[PDB]
């Protein structure tokens, strides 16, 4: 029983701390849209009008109440901010809409170790799912005028058939929409408290056009000249999730009860936050995640189909019987078809865009070195031995805070567990 003399692959020590919390620019699994189908009102397309139209699809509003106060914050300024936006909408015709720079607005508009907590893995599982709606390929259909090899467009087009209804795709489209509206407002007003509706559009299970309202953002002042100059903002986001079941996830938020829906109470997650022309541009460019994940899908498919000396694309996507380990359940490791693979590799790329951080950039470069070293131990019956740097020390040092980074560690631990069991 002296394994204790041997150095072999242990898992990574994650940090002790109060449970990690949510920190993305907007809500993910917890989001709630009010929407309109076939929208055709006068001025459709125009955010503020579309928004007013989504707000009128709902009749359950009640008198706002704080229900999970932010504990750094002056909570009643967040009620007054909601109430203010509610008030300022009940009106008569213009395109955009600045808020009375009231007292509670002006206020609202201006390491510690934490441990892993389950909500993040649950968010990840939701991101990989199919939705009833599709989030790309929404226009009238036409030729692919665009010069691209046969097999490469076959792969691209198969992938799209698998990711177009993926929930991670809604998140890309949501970041694109919101960030680009934010850039627009930040540059037109600059001295204005513009009310910025959080929108996406999609097409439904039946094929209808649909426009969605997740909530609203108010911009602070936006005289920005460095790319790094910061726009404060307050985001207010509808949700049906009762923040009291997992109050640790909501530490950054004041949460209000604002209504009932068909029957559950309805919540508004509120928090202040900040961005810059560079972060907004990052959001605006979240379709790169479709690219990134296609390329890894394509090279998985290359590698395999070279072994078998035929193109396997068609057979992988259609028969759905080649599979790949990609998840775990109470029975051990589970394999899925190429379509779950595309959606999951999508979601990983989207999350690590939603949670970009230096801790991620470190963890992911160092852990790759260990990865290759553990696959070499695994794949070679006389593998030899390997020098770690302070590989463990370089990796483990990235594990401070970050919910996303900390799952990735947990996920890597799982792997080590199985790679060598």
């Amino acid at each position: 029983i002296e394994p204790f003399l041997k150095t072999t692959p242990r898992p990574l020590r994650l940090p002790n701390g109060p449970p990690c919390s949510q920190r993305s620019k907007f809500l993910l699994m917890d989001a709630l849209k009010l929407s309109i189908e076939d929208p055709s009102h006068e001025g459709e397309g125009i955010p503020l009008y579309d928004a007013i139209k989504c707000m009128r699809t709902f009749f359950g509003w009640k008198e706002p109440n704080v229900v999970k106060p932010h504990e750094k914050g002056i909570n009643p300024n967040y009620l007054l901010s909601w109430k203010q936006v509610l008030a300022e909408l009940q009106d008569i015709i213009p395109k955009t809409k600045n808020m009375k720079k009231t007292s509670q607005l002006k206020w609202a508009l201006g390491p510690e170790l934490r441990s892993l907590a389950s909500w993040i893995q649950n968010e990840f599982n939701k991101a990989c799912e199919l939705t009833d709606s599709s989030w790309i390929e929404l226009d009238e259909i036409g030729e692919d005028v665009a010069p691209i090899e046969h097999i490469a467009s076959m792969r691209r087009n198969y992938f799209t058939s698998e990711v177009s209804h993926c929930r991670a795709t809604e998140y890309i489209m949501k970041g694109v929409y919101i960030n680009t509206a934010l850039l627009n407002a930040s540059c037109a007003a600059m001295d204005d408290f513009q009310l910025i509706p959080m929108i996406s559009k999609c097409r439904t299970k039946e094929g209808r056009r649909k426009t969605n309202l997740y909530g609203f953002i108010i911009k602070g002042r936006s005289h920005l000249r460095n790319d790094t100059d910061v726009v404060n903002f307050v985001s207010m986001e509808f949700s049906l999730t009762d923040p009291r079941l997992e109050p640790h996830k909501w530490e950054k938020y004041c949460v209000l009860e604002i209504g009932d829906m068909l029957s559950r109470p309805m919540f508004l997650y509120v928090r202040t936050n900040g961005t810059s022309k560079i972060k907004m541009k990052w959001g605006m460019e979240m379709r790169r995640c479709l690219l990134q994940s296609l390329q890894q899908i394509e090279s998985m498919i290359e590698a395999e189909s070279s072994v078998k000396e035929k193109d396997m694309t068609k057979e992988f996507f259609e028969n759905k019987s080649e599979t790949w380990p990609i998840g775990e359940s109470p029975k051990g490791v589970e394999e899925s078809s190429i379509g779950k693979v595309c959606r999951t590799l999508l979601a990983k790329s989207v999350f690590n865009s939603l949670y970009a951080s230096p801790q991620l950039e470190g963890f992911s470069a160092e852990s790759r070195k260990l990865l290759l070293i553990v696959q070499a131990l695994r794949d070679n019956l006389e593998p030899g031995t390997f020098d770690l740097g302070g590989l463990y020390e370089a990796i483990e040092e990235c594990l401070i805070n970050d919910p996303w980074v900390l799952l990735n560690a947990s996920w890597f631990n799982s792997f080590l567990t199985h790679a060598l069991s």
């Binding site: 893995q121 590698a303 990609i326 990983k348 790759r368 990735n408 792997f415």
Partner: peptide
């Protein structure tokens, strides 16, 4: 299932 995409590497040689 809990989805864990680093479990791919039980099968896919890190490209």
């Amino acid at each position: 299932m809990d989805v864990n995409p680093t479990l791919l590497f039980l099968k896919v040689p890190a490209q």
